[PDB]
């Protein structure tokens, strides 16, 4: 999360995280920071029990390199997470987000396993019972007109899936916005 303590403040700043991301350079080393100090610096002091327990799993997948330290390169990826920048960059970022957590080629069944990584039926609305039926139903209808499995170019096609799906994914793919989910 963050230490600004105010969603409204973030909206006004529209770049609060970015400014601190550059400032840490003067305080934090050139490009080396631990995960503990990372979470401590950003926040996670109180009012984060089970929610923290779920963020740990997401953190490992979001880490990408799944390392025990945060390098300079990680920050670059982090910036893309908070924003989107250029549309071309967004597409690369989308693929990078997955950082190939498998052996390549993603089918509907695998997608159901990734889902936990994104978000469960935690939301009060949506997912009448399970989000999995939504992915299969949209996937089945699309049928990609052959080649159901997702390759490289089709990889981006996954985001096309559905706006309702994308809306939930958008909330998941973020750093400080996550605070919104906690409030929900």
Coordinates of C-alpha atoms in Angstrom, one line a residue:
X1 CA 0.0 0.0 0.0
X2 CA 1.3 3.4 1.0
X3 CA 1.8 5.8 4.0
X4 CA 0.0 8.8 2.5
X5 CA -3.1 7.7 4.4
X6 CA -5.8 9.1 2.1
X7 CA -7.3 7.8 -1.1
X8 CA -8.4 11.4 -2.0
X9 CA -4.8 12.5 -1.6
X10 CA -3.6 9.9 -4.1
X11 CA -6.2 11.1 -6.6
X12 CA -5.1 14.7 -6.2
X13 CA -1.4 13.7 -6.5
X14 CA -2.1 11.4 -9.5
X15 CA 1.7 10.7 -9.1
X16 CA 2.4 10.3 -5.4
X17 CA 3.9 6.8 -5.8
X18 CA 6.0 8.0 -8.8
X19 CA 7.6 10.9 -6.8
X20 CA 8.5 8.6 -3.9
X21 CA 9.8 6.0 -6.3
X22 CA 12.5 8.6 -7.4
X23 CA 13.0 10.0 -3.9
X24 CA 13.9 6.6 -2.5
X25 CA 17.0 6.8 -4.7
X26 CA 18.4 9.4 -2.3
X27 CA 17.5 7.4 0.8
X28 CA 17.6 3.8 -0.4
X29 CA 20.7 2.3 -2.1
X30 CA 21.3 2.7 -5.8
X31 CA 19.2 -0.3 -6.6
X32 CA 18.9 -2.7 -3.7
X33 CA 16.1 -3.1 -1.1
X34 CA 14.8 -6.0 1.0
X35 CA 11.2 -7.2 0.9
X36 CA 10.7 -6.6 4.6
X37 CA 11.9 -3.0 4.4
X38 CA 9.9 -2.7 1.1
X39 CA 6.6 -3.6 2.8
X40 CA 7.5 -1.7 5.9
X41 CA 8.3 1.5 3.9
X42 CA 5.2 1.3 1.8
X43 CA 3.0 0.3 4.8
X44 CA 1.3 -2.8 6.2
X45 CA 1.5 -1.7 9.9
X46 CA -2.0 -2.7 11.1
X47 CA -5.5 -3.5 9.9
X48 CA -3.9 -6.1 7.6
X49 CA -4.3 -9.6 9.1
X50 CA -5.7 -12.2 6.7
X51 CA -5.4 -9.6 3.9
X52 CA -1.7 -9.8 4.4
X53 CA -1.8 -13.6 4.2
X54 CA -3.4 -13.3 0.8
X55 CA -1.0 -10.5 -0.4
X56 CA 2.0 -12.8 0.3
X57 CA 0.8 -15.3 -2.3
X58 CA 0.2 -12.5 -4.8
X59 CA 3.6 -10.9 -3.9
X60 CA 5.5 -14.1 -4.9
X61 CA 3.8 -14.1 -8.4
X62 CA 4.1 -10.3 -8.7
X63 CA 7.8 -10.6 -7.8
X64 CA 8.5 -12.3 -11.2
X65 CA 12.1 -13.3 -10.3
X66 CA 10.7 -14.6 -7.0
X67 CA 13.9 -13.4 -5.4
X68 CA 14.5 -12.3 -1.8
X69 CA 15.6 -8.7 -2.8
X70 CA 14.3 -5.9 -4.9
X71 CA 16.7 -4.6 -7.7
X72 CA 16.5 -1.5 -9.9
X73 CA 14.9 -3.4 -12.7
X74 CA 12.1 -4.5 -10.4
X75 CA 11.2 -0.9 -9.9
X76 CA 10.8 -0.4 -13.6
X77 CA 8.3 -3.2 -13.7
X78 CA 6.7 -1.7 -10.6
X79 CA 6.1 1.6 -12.3
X80 CA 4.3 -0.1 -15.1
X81 CA 2.1 -1.9 -12.5
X82 CA 0.9 1.4 -11.0
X83 CA 0.4 3.1 -14.4
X84 CA 0.4 1.9 -18.0
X85 CA 2.5 4.5 -19.9
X86 CA 2.5 3.9 -23.6
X87 CA 0.0 1.4 -25.1
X88 CA 2.8 -0.5 -26.6
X89 CA 4.5 -0.7 -23.2
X90 CA 1.3 -1.9 -21.7
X91 CA 1.1 -4.9 -24.0
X92 CA 4.7 -5.9 -23.1
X93 CA 3.9 -5.3 -19.4
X94 CA 0.8 -7.5 -19.6
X95 CA 2.9 -10.4 -20.9
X96 CA 5.7 -9.7 -18.4
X97 CA 3.1 -9.7 -15.6
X98 CA 2.7 -13.5 -16.2
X99 CA 6.4 -13.8 -16.7
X100 CA 5.7 -17.3 -18.0
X101 CA 4.7 -19.0 -14.8
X102 CA 4.3 -22.2 -16.7
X103 CA 6.0 -24.1 -19.7
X104 CA 4.2 -21.8 -22.2
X105 CA 0.9 -22.1 -24.0
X106 CA -2.0 -21.2 -21.7
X107 CA -5.3 -23.0 -21.9
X108 CA -8.7 -22.4 -20.2
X109 CA -7.9 -25.0 -17.5
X110 CA -4.6 -23.4 -16.6
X111 CA -6.3 -20.0 -16.5
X112 CA -8.6 -21.4 -13.8
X113 CA -5.5 -22.1 -11.7
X114 CA -4.0 -18.7 -12.3
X115 CA -7.3 -17.1 -11.2
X116 CA -6.3 -17.6 -7.6
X117 CA -3.4 -15.4 -8.4
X118 CA -5.7 -12.6 -9.5
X119 CA -8.6 -12.7 -7.0
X120 CA -11.1 -15.1 -5.5
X121 CA -14.8 -14.6 -4.9
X122 CA -13.8 -12.1 -2.2
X123 CA -15.9 -9.3 -3.9
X124 CA -19.4 -8.9 -2.5
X125 CA -20.8 -8.9 -6.1
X126 CA -19.8 -10.5 -9.4
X127 CA -19.1 -14.2 -9.6
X128 CA -22.6 -15.3 -8.8
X129 CA -20.9 -18.4 -7.4
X130 CA -17.5 -18.8 -9.0
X131 CA -15.4 -16.7 -11.3
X132 CA -14.2 -19.8 -13.1
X133 CA -17.6 -20.3 -14.9
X134 CA -17.2 -16.8 -16.3
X135 CA -13.8 -17.5 -17.8
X136 CA -15.0 -20.8 -19.4
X137 CA -18.2 -19.3 -20.7
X138 CA -16.4 -16.4 -22.4
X139 CA -13.6 -18.6 -23.6
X140 CA -16.0 -21.2 -25.0
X141 CA -18.0 -18.5 -26.9
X142 CA -14.8 -16.9 -28.3
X143 CA -13.4 -20.4 -29.2
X144 CA -10.7 -18.2 -30.8
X145 CA -12.2 -19.6 -34.0
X146 CA -9.8 -22.5 -33.7
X147 CA -6.5 -22.8 -31.7
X148 CA -8.2 -22.5 -28.3
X149 CA -4.9 -22.6 -26.5
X150 CA -3.2 -19.2 -26.1
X151 CA 0.1 -18.5 -27.9
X152 CA 2.1 -15.3 -28.1
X153 CA 0.0 -13.0 -30.2
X154 CA -3.1 -14.6 -28.8
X155 CA -1.6 -14.0 -25.4
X156 CA -2.9 -10.4 -25.5
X157 CA -6.2 -11.7 -26.7
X158 CA -6.8 -12.9 -23.1
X159 CA -7.2 -9.3 -21.9
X160 CA -9.9 -8.9 -24.6
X161 CA -11.9 -11.7 -22.9
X162 CA -14.5 -9.5 -21.2
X163 CA -14.8 -6.0 -19.6
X164 CA -16.3 -7.6 -16.5
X165 CA -13.3 -9.9 -16.2
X166 CA -10.9 -7.1 -17.1
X167 CA -12.4 -4.8 -14.5
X168 CA -11.6 -7.3 -11.8
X169 CA -8.1 -7.9 -13.2
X170 CA -7.5 -4.2 -13.3
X171 CA -8.0 -3.9 -9.6
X172 CA -5.7 -6.9 -9.0
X173 CA -3.0 -5.5 -11.2
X174 CA -2.0 -2.6 -8.9
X175 CA 0.1 -1.6 -5.9
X176 CA -1.8 1.1 -3.9
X177 CA -5.2 0.6 -5.5
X178 CA -5.4 -2.7 -3.6
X179 CA -6.4 -0.6 -0.6
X180 CA -9.7 -0.2 -2.4
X181 CA -10.3 -4.0 -2.3
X182 CA -9.6 -4.0 1.5
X183 CA -12.3 -1.3 2.0
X184 CA -14.8 -3.4 -0.1

